[PDB]
Amino acid sequence: IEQVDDELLSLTAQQENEEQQQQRKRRRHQFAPMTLEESPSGYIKKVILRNFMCHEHFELELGSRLNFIVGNNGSGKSAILTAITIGLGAKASETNRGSSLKDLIREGCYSAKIILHLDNSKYGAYQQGIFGNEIIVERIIKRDGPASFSLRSENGKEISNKKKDIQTVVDYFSVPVSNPMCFLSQDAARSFLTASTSQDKYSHFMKGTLLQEITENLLYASAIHDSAQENMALHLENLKSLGQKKYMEIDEALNRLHNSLKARDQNYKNAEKGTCFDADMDFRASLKVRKFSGNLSFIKDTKSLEIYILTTNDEKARNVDTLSGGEKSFSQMALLLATWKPMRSRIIALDEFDVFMDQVNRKIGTTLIVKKLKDIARTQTIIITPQDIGKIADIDSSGVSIHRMRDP
């Protein structure tokens, strides 16, 4: 089958291009010695939205570590997350906020502007000499003409107008805008938090941690390798019956694919073990808030994630499904945090969760979010909730920023 050989050659060429791209990358960190407690650079200091969706030109100074936007639902509560995802650069279909980029523009106006101010004063800055202490990211969406950009600096000097600079800056800051879990919308949060079957938990965890795509690519490459090996045996038979140039090309491609597959298998095993270890440890540390003790177990025989929790009353770690609604909701929230943890994300955003938890459990879940997220300085979190956090007694803790919208 010549199509199998063609697929093998195409996969080999793709691997060649990927290894050239890997070879092209260099080191970007210089290790400025300097002085820990202080947050690194890259977090969003402020966002201003001029004629964007519903409300008019609006300023919002997000905090460094944990943010609690209390914009009420139905008043453009999700506008901030959509604006951040669009400005940082993301696919429209991934966002799923609006039918088209044209509709994001306010009605009656031809253009809308999204301006972000990433911080560069603190360490880890990306070319702090050129961009200064701030990097401004402004995107213009017009009904007529293509969407425009500029990556201007504080002085207004437009450093660039392209989009590849967006990706370079974002990747240096490590903001997974391409991953639809780091920026959880309402529907995605509902789908994740309501997961019931262990298979659903496994699917959501592997997809969000970007481990499912790796396994899909690996299995596709393995199938291509097996089919190409069978066609290689057939080609050997035909060659003996009789071509040598083709036989050398196919044998070289097959050997390269075999070695690449072994390397990729080792890489995937290491990555899966590391990610699952981080998730397990963070879940164990999260359950201690409720005076519980539990663990995660990932099974490939059942292709499922099993949560085991031991509470105060019993002496045997029952299955998490053998619990009550509040305990299961707390476990799901802890799993969400323990899935955010392995993928080190500079910025994380989330919509409301108050409808998935009822009364006391909801307060405990908000307490868990605050306690686990206000400590870390590497990750800035923007939580958009309609429920007033100020009613919760756990607001006295420093590092939590609540921006309650005066306009309902």
Place this chain on the structure above:
Amino acid sequence: NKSIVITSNTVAKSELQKSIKFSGSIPEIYLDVVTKETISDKYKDWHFISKNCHYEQLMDLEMKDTAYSFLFGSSRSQGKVPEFVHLKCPSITNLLVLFGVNQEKCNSLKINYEKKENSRYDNLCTIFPVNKMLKFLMYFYSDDDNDDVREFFLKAFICLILDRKVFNAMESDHRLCFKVLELFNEAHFINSYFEIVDKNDFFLHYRLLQIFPHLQSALLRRRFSEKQGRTETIQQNIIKEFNEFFDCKNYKNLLYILTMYGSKFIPFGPKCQVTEYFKDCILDISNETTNDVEISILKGILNLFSKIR
């Protein structure tokens, strides 16, 4: 007759089979798994002993050693039971020949990195048990002599313990090895060791720190010495070496990170800046699709060391 070889394994498997120093079966599956690694250097290592041990003479030494007149602990003086050891093996070089080291390596106790003697396939040569070998070597210590003989003994011991076969067949407690190490000054031991091995051969550095962990700090003080590092501190030199290995893409030597961690300069912990910089660079290069496995191994190891309090 155009197709004559099977990938590149045929020549490698054949010429591993020819120089095999073993009288047995040697199934082709072993040769295939050895010669088709291409990812890790598990089967290429420093082999001090490259010939079959003289089993008969070594057993004669052993029955002489187990039962003898004094039947007491061998003292460093009085010649270390000369009466039979000089009749059997008069010199330490003869003892090393009995162990399996050839004369050419005995004459020049160094690891020839040009001849790739630090990366050789296992010769599958039978070796005599390590503890009795260390005892026979201790019989040639002879504290009361000139410096050249002691230096030769020290370098021979260092070459022996770094051997892959000796290290694998080594006992859990390094009682005899600890005794030999305590015979010599620690700084003198480290200086002789760095005379033997290359200074950037961090794989053997990690092996030595596996044998003698308590040497770690001292070894670093010989690798990134403050006086020899000009006004730069030891941590700055460690950062510079990490930078140079990172830029040269010597990921195996970079991984053998395993030597640095745990010392006073680079400790375990979550709040250290150096580990964060290392991880920041590792996540920079890591692609997880087409990479060297050493990058993922470094990512996992650095994460583990960051978690260790």
Place this chain on the structure above:
Amino acid sequence: DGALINSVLYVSPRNGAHYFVELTEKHLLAFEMLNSMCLLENYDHVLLFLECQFGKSHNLAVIPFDIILVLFTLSTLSEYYKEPILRANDPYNTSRETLSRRALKLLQKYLAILKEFDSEQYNLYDLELLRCQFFLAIDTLTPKKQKWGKTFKNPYRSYISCLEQRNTILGNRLLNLKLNEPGEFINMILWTLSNSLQESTPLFLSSHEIWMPLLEILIDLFSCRQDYFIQHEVAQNVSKSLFVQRLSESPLAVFFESLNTRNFANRFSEYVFLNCDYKLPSDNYATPVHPVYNGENTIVDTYIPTIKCSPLYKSQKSLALRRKLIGSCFKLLLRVPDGHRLITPRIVADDVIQGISRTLASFNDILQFKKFFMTENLSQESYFIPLLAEGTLSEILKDTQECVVILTLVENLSDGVSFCNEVIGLVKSKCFAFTEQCSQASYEEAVLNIEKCDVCLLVLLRYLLHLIGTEAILDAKEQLEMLHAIEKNDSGRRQWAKALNLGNDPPLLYPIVSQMFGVHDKSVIIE
């Protein structure tokens, strides 16, 4: 004795354990990390976690008990028959060492750490926690009732163990579960003792790579547990009859309860000296032995056995292990109050002494005999070795000479003069002297008996020197007369050396006693 047995500052005794130590935050996090890594089958990073901070710090990283059990099971995954599985688990052998070897090395190093409490090197809390973990592992490894041929309880509520949801590590069942079966502990002991001297490569590799080190570790841990039990679990003052009942519950009592058989004396004597040189008496039934973990008796194709051990090396190690077993037996026995005898194990010190003496005096190879009686540390084995020596000597004198002279040498170790007088009495009786009733044809067996006799007397003499030193070898005329009587027996043996029955010189112990305490042949060459 030491601090390992009498350091209970940080203990929090519970119903199941008296050595129990609560966890601190750092140790809790370490336990959680180790169990989390073990869940992912990332044993390489478990071993790296333990090794990377070993010996590089003042504080100690304590291994959890379930991780200790995991390491025990890992030590049974030897490369010679599990090479494909180990290569599959760790394709990039970053440590250049097998998982089995690394786990075994960690176990032995931590056992060495535990055996002596360096309060200056390590703080006391970590050492007590390590002792608690090892003791919990041992208590989980209680043998099942002996067979001729409960799931997992975690004392700590602060973390979920990795062993709760699994029972196999890499296709090998957990060591505790395998040994917590009716006829597997005795099977393992007999297997390792039989294969310790095998010339078959797979059997010898199974004994030499897996089971002798593990048995060493287990015996040492059971000895420490026995000491701790006698120190704390008993009620101090006692009516001497409840103490026997408590001793029947001791860890060594349960250890040897799986070895009771029908007659403990003779069956135990055969068990310890299984596959030795001695002739089997009274046609004892052969003891079936089978590999513990599936194909222990096979060598995988990929592995190439490239290590050779001389027969002296193998015999020395096997006899040392046998001595350790016998020493544990005597350590259990010597605590039994006089008159009373244990209830659950039907064991008596006299019976075991006589059985071991019968097996030792029946050795036809002197090498194994000497290996048994040559010990590197006299003080360690001082409480049973002189008894075995004197018993074997008594039996040899009984079979060689019709008149059995009663030997009081063991208690005569207190007074060197009495020991020398008794030696003079034995040699003048010609019992220690080479016997005239022995025929020319059977000269070799008589030589064997005499050389074993000399070995036993030499052992007793070394112990006498260990207990009294060299002070009155010539100052007291009794010791001088003992030396001259040794010379008299020298002349007696030299009589037949000149009788020229065989060219080989008979065993003469004058040079050896001269080297030890004969003052280099008295004044023959000195003056």
Place this chain on the structure above:
Amino acid sequence: IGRSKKVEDFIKNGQDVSKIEITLKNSPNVTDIEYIDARDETIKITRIITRSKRRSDYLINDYQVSESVVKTLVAQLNIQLDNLCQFLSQERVEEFARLKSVKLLVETIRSIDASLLDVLDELRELQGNEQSLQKDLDQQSKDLETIKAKLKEDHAVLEPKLDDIVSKISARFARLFNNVGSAGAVRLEKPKDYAEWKIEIMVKFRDNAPLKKLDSHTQSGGERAVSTVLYMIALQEFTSAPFRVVDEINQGMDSRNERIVHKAMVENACAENTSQYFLITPKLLTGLHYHEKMRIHCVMAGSWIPNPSEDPKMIHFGETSNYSFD
């Protein structure tokens, strides 16, 4: 009996002669008997061991005979000593522990006449060489028809008998393994080559253990012992041996497999006209089940109990029906 020979052990230390007497039912189907009529129902066989005399002298109804007569009587009672099926010893237990399918085929073909297998092997070799001559040919054409006809006739004669035997033994295996709660059958796989026919045993006593041939290393000792004991029991009613002897069997196998095999033995003893087994229990088992049909015998002696010789009622050991009248 597959064990070491120690004649002096039987002889009492000090006594010149040691005597065993055994009485069996007699039927008019065995020849070469002394003093005993065919209609008589008593066969008394006595064996004496003495130090001074070294000869094989037995007694039949208290009449001295050579060992040949008693041996041929044992042969004519359909009971065998060398064969491992009728008598089971420790060495024989070990030999059954690691048992191959070829040994199962051998014992099956030795139970029935073994001439059939030899004839079929000869015919299959004739078929092979005839086919070789046929491909060489590709006088010969006249062959391969009579040969194949003879092979088909022999196979047609052979098939139903072994088929019914295998079905019966498999049914017995299932009915004996039902108490274990496991399904197993003794199947005779019959490839095209007659010598390649093998015996398969299906194992279900352990869920983890897959269905495979019996072997000691993979399976546990107790389950294997129970399986082989049940296989021995299945081949008892078909055999004409008056009884079967098993040694070192009741010694504990996990106290669970031994319990279920004792239950199977009880169930077998429930059926009447069954073979008598001389059971050996080296190790006592707590809570042993005692059926009413079977009776336990104890040989242990007590310090307070008088000497058996001096006490008229102490001569019997482990017997209760002796005290009661009739």
